[PDB]
């Protein structure tokens, strides 16, 4: 059985908290490879399933993601409640994030003449800060996520007390041990997609793109551009324009995250300070978000 090392220590399948299957009830589906359910163990949970029709590599991938998430301990990384690996289909049990993924949330919660005040600049800044805090924890523990993006973040709830958390660690799992068309090239810095070089500054670039996703309210990055067009665009120095109504101080964080040389990009401590300073600036947080008609 394969081992996993994080923050100094090594763990194995034996270290995962096995929850007796009889104690697990599935309630409803929550919408690729394997299904997700709302469940109860009472403790409410999200259940990620491994299809019984899978390869040996699939099994090991499933095991590795369980190990990875179980070994993190931070408020902005989704918790793993445990696993049920001794029955089929196999389960990973996660903290239930009723807000759903960040991309879907932003698109369905965009200000509307029906809901003119569904979201404000401060809400977006708080989400950005939440994820940045999660990224800082990963960075200080020498973990490179490789796929920081809105689709991979979850929210505790739709309402005002919401907390955003990094949730999907599939890319990191894959690399820890595929194809060009599945690579998240629109979130990747030049040295990543060209040389396959990944560092903490990789996640900084991706976080810049996430920031754009957030302040665009859930648009796909590089509108109208294909993966290869983005690759050539970014390699040549091209960068995205500010999202609609984006305050200048916020856009400047994005452009710093997208510096061509990794050494010129901020670490997450600095990104956090700059997000904090934005939340303090009345001219930033008093800026109205566009209302979608």
Ligand X SMILES: C[C@@H](Oc1cc(-c2cnn(C3CCNCC3)c2)cnc1N)c1c(Cl)ccc(F)c1Cl
Stretch touching ligand X by CB under 6 A, among 95-103, 122-130, 175-183, 187-195: 95-103
Residue 67 assigned to a binding site: no
Catalytic residue numbers read 147
**What are the residues facing 223 on neighbouring strands?**
none
As given in the structure block, the two tokens for residue 223 are 């509108």
Stretch touching ligand X by CB under 6 A, among 89-97, 115-123, 187-195, 231-239: 89-97
Q: Kindly state whether residue 130 participates in binding ligand X, applying the rule CB under 6 A.
A: no
For residues 292 and 187, give the distance between their C-alpha atoms in angstroms, rounded to a whole number.
Answer: 26
Q: Kindly state whether residue 163 participates in binding ligand X, applying the rule CB under 6 A.
A: no
What is the dihedral angle through the alpha carbons of 117, 121, 125, 128, rounded to the nearest 10 degrees? 70
Residue 168 assigned to a binding site: yes
Cα-flanking dihedrals φ and ψ of residue 18, to 5°?
A: -80, 115
Residue 241 assigned to a binding site: no
Q: Any idea what the Cα angle at residue 60 is, between residues 173 and 1, rounded to 5°?
A: 115
Q: Kindly state whether residue 78 participates in binding ligand X, applying the rule CB under 6 A.
A: yes
Q: Smallest gap, in angstroms, from Cβ of residue 94 to ligand X? A: 4
Q: Kindly state whether residue 100 participates in binding ligand X, applying the rule CB under 6 A.
A: yes
Give the pairing type, strands 153-155 and 100-101.
Answer: antiparallel
Q: Kindly state whether residue 278 participates in binding ligand X, applying the rule CB under 6 A.
A: no
Task: Please report how the helices 200-215 and 268-280 are oriented relative to each other, as an axis angle in degrees rounded to 10.
Answer: 30
Binding site for ligand X (CB under 6 A): 30-31, 36, 46, 48, 78, 94-97, 100-101, 152, 154, 167-168
What residues are designated binding site for ATP? 48, 95-97, 168
């Amino acid at each position: 059985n394969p081992n996993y090392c994080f923050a100094g220590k090594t763990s194995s399948i034996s270290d995962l908290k096995e929850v007796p299957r009889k104690n697990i009830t599935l309630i409803r589906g929550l919408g690729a490879f394997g299904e997700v359910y709302e469940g109860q163990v009472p403790l409410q949970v999200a259940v990620k399933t491994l299809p019984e029709v899978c390869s040996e590599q699939d099994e090991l991938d499933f095991l590795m993601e369980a190990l990875i998430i179980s070994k993190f301990n931070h408020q902005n990384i989704v918790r793993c409640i445990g696993v049920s690996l001794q029955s089929l289909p196999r389960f990973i049990l996660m903290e239930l994030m009723a807000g759903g993924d960040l991309k879907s949330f932003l698109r369905e919660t965009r200000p509307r003449p029906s809901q003119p005040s569904s979201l404000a600049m401060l809400d977006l800044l708080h989400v950005a800060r939440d994820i940045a805090c999660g990224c800082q924890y990963l960075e200080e523990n020498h973990f490179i996520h490789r796929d920081i993006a809105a689709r991979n973040c979850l929210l505790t709830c739709p309402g005002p007390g919401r907390v955003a958390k990094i949730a999907d660690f599939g890319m990191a799992r894959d690399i820890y041990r595929g194809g060009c068309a599945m690579l998240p090239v629109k979130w990747m810095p030049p040295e990543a997609f060209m040389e396959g070089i990944f560092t903490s500054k990789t996640d900084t670039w991706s976080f810049g793109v996430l920031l754009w996703e957030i302040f665009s309210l859930g648009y796909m990055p590089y509108p109208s551009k294909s993966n290869q067009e983005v690759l050539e665009f970014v390699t040549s120095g091209g960068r995205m324009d500010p999202p609609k109504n984006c305050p200048g101080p916020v856009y400047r964080i994005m452009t710093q995250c997208w510096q061509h040389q990794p050494e010129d990009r901020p670490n997450f401590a600095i990104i956090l300070e700059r997000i904090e300073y934005c939340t303090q600036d009345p001219d930033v947080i008093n800026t109205a978000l566009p209302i979608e008609y």
